[PDB]
Design a protein around this ligand. Structure first.
Ligand SMILES: Nc1ncnc2c1ncn2[C@@H]1O[C@H](CN(CCC[C@H]2CNCc3c2ccc(Cl)c3Cl)CC[C@H](N)C(=O)O)[C@@H](O)[C@H]1O
Ligand SMILES: Nc1ncnc2c1ncn2[C@@H]1O[C@H](CSCC[C@H](N)C(=O)O)[C@@H](O)[C@H]1O
Ligand SMILES: [K+]
Lengths: 266, 260
């Protein structure tokens, strides 16, 4: 079973809104980094503090379902010299490309880049951060989390990878907890034993709007998320919860919170 | 008595490209003169020992960077300059009009050095908040603001960057103009002064201006001669890659002194 639900999301995402998605989630005021209790700051804080331990370093990194965004690698690029970026839609790989080349009409991430520099407290100016990322991002490859080999056979990516990053993928492209738990299993086939996984997801989210489609996805929870990481060969080192305030409960989702997980593969 | 007429020819927008656009205004290299200046101010304030209610910025010119670290410690500050073209240029930045100079790059790097987690927009609007007025001034006057000015004298603290040395023909009229502004300060109030070292001229478009060449120890002697006690005085040595054709400045000094 379970392949029908998956096919439902692949359909829902063919209506996907590359630049509309950014304007409505990462441009102000939904993305206001001035607010220190808010959600942009929190995600970036979790990423900066985790790499601050230095215990997550190496050679190769893979972003799992990057979408058309980068904030999730900002604090992370000073620590890996080979970044792999991935998404399922060509039109999202193409919007990232609009940003690696530095065109006008590419999304201005600079206000995230600065906040990350501020949190890391190393004196870095956001332009050198943005130059570092554009150096280390070596490839941008198609991804499907529901395959047994998510990039395909003989993929370009240097494998195994030393760590993994993923923001709002699995709980957002999986229709049932079984689909999730197996997708989490698929990407760990890419993480070398002893490497680290950094995850960010929605909590108790069952429906959201990708372009025009109203797709159906798993109401996942903090405790289910732990249980699923252990089930796949990790030990959970960190697991933090953000409670979604009233200021951003549009009517686009039933998202009640967001979680960050740091787990290491045994 | 003979006074620097040369300043009516001073283009503000060309001074701004000369000094605060890159290379000198590229804050990415941290051995550079821009970062260095901002550090001195943040460090002096992070002590909390400079604090109060009122602050006056003398010879501000068309610049604002010198109050970024400052506005978190004084609720009422006023900015001053001799020339109207400059008070107008501050006007357009504080009121957010167009044609206004983009200072964000400097706000950004001040939020970075302090490390309060500050949004650089919050820093900018806190300053626009706390600037109350933009008044003219002549530092050679025994009273440089005129009588009965809107300003709340005596201030808790003063700031001045690249002013006195850039407006005095010789050491003594500089030493005089320093005397002239100490009169503006509450005893026990603090002075934060930045200027050029062994500079003699600089360019501001068509204007070609004259500076008296001063040294670190000369700069110290003049502060005690005005009734100050220096709690810090440091020197930046202008590196080759910032020696362009806009002046002959050889270094930059910073001073933290307390009126006794
Ligand atoms: N089978 C598949 N296999 C592999 N990859 C697939 C598959 N199917 C689809 N993808 C690709 O996953 C990407 C999901 N993408 C948007 C979803 C998040 C969205 C959901 N609603 C709650 C949540 C939203 C985001 C922000 C917040 Cl705060 C909230 Cl509330 C992540 C964006 C980026 N990573 C980000 O961090 O913003 C997308 O680019 C697909 O193309
Ligand atoms: N006689 C005088 N009395 C007081 N200020 C004067 C003056 N003659 C010129 N000035 C001002 O002193 C400034 C010197 S350069 C401006 C320095 C400024 N604080 C900065 O950081 O860039 C000029 O703006 C000029 O208008
Ligand atoms: K000068």
């Amino acid at each position: 079973d379970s392949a029908p639900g998956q096919a439902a999301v692949a359909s829902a995402y063919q209506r996907f809104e590359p630049r509309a998605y950014l304007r409505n989630n990462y441009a102000p005021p939904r993305g206001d980094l001035c607010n220190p209790n808010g959600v942009g700051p929190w995600k970036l804080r979790c990423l900066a503090q985790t790499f601050a331990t230095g215990e997550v370093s190496g050679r190769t990194l893979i972003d799992i379902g990057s979408g058309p965004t980068v904030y999730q690698l900002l604090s992370a690029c000073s620590h890996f010299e080979d970044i792999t970026m991935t998404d399922f839609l060509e039109v999202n790989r193409q919007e990232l490309g609009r940003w690696l080349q530095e065109e006008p009409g590419a999304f201005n991430w600079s206000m995230y880049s600065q906040h990350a520099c501020l949190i890391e407290g190393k004196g870095e100016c956001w332009q050198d951060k943005e130059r570092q990322l554009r150096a280390r991002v070596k490839r941008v490859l198609p991804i499907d989390v529901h395959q047994p080999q998510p990039l395909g056979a003989g993929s370009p990516a240097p494998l195994p990878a030393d760590a993994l990053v993923s923001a709002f993928c699995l709980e957002a492209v999986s229709p049932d907890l079984a689909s999730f738990q197996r997708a989490l299993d698929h990407i760990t086939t890419l993480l070398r034993p002893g490497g680290h996984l950094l995850l960010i997801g929605a909590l108790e989210e069952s429906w959201y709007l990708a372009g025009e489609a109203r797709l159906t996805v798993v109401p996942v929870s903090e405790e289910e998320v732990r249980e699923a990481l252990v089930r796949s060969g990790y030990k959970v080192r960190d697991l933090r919860t953000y409670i979604m305030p009233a200021h951003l409960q549009t009517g686009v989702d039933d998202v009640k919170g967001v979680f960050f997980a740091w787990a290491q593969k045994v």
